[PDB]
């Protein structure tokens, strides 16, 4: 036992709200998500009850979010200078462009509801940043990219 994020509220609720699955489910995978400590939507992939698609499209226009072919793009060496993938990894978001002329940033991270990760990615560089939707495969292979010693063991 242990809490959830803000965004783990939120997505809770459009879930209901989207009309995906009853509040009973959503009751019944609140405390499967305090046991893996991942957000909300994480525990709703890996227990194959909605991929992150299902869940991003329905913020995507509730927000106006904007998504990215990010599977399509290859990280800079020039952005990696914002913060590590090993950062990135435990911020479930990955950067891919670095404007310091104007300090600003682009990210893509697996949570949009999740404004606390957002605060932490904005304060920890004192600047503003720019948060876009992708989607597990794409998230896997800048960390594949940027660490294959490890090659992502299963």
Do not use: C
Not at 13 to 35: C, F, K, N, V, Y
Request: glycine content about 6%; hydrophobic content about 45%; proline content about 6%.
């Amino acid at each position: 036992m242990s809490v959830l994020t803000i965004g783990d509220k939120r997505l809770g609720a459009a879930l209901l709200d989207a009309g995906l699955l009853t509040d009973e489910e959503l009751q019944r995978a609140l405390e499967r998500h305090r046991e893996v400590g991942g957000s909300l939507a994480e525990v709703l992939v890996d227990m194959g009850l909605l991929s992150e698609r299902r869940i991003a499209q329905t913020i995507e226009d509730r927000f106006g979010i904007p998504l990215v072919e990010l599977h399509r793009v290859e990280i800079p060496p020039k952005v990696k200078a914002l913060l590590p993938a090993e950062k990135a990894k435990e911020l479930k978001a990955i950067p891919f462009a670095l404007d310091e002329e104007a300090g600003v940033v682009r990210v893509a991270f697996l949570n949009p509801l999740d404004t606390l990760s957002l605060e932490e990615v904005e304060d920890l560089t004192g600047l503003v940043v720019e948060p876009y939707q992708t989607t597990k495969s794409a998230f896997l292979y800048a960390l594949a990219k940027h660490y294959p010693e490890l090659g992502l063991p299963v």
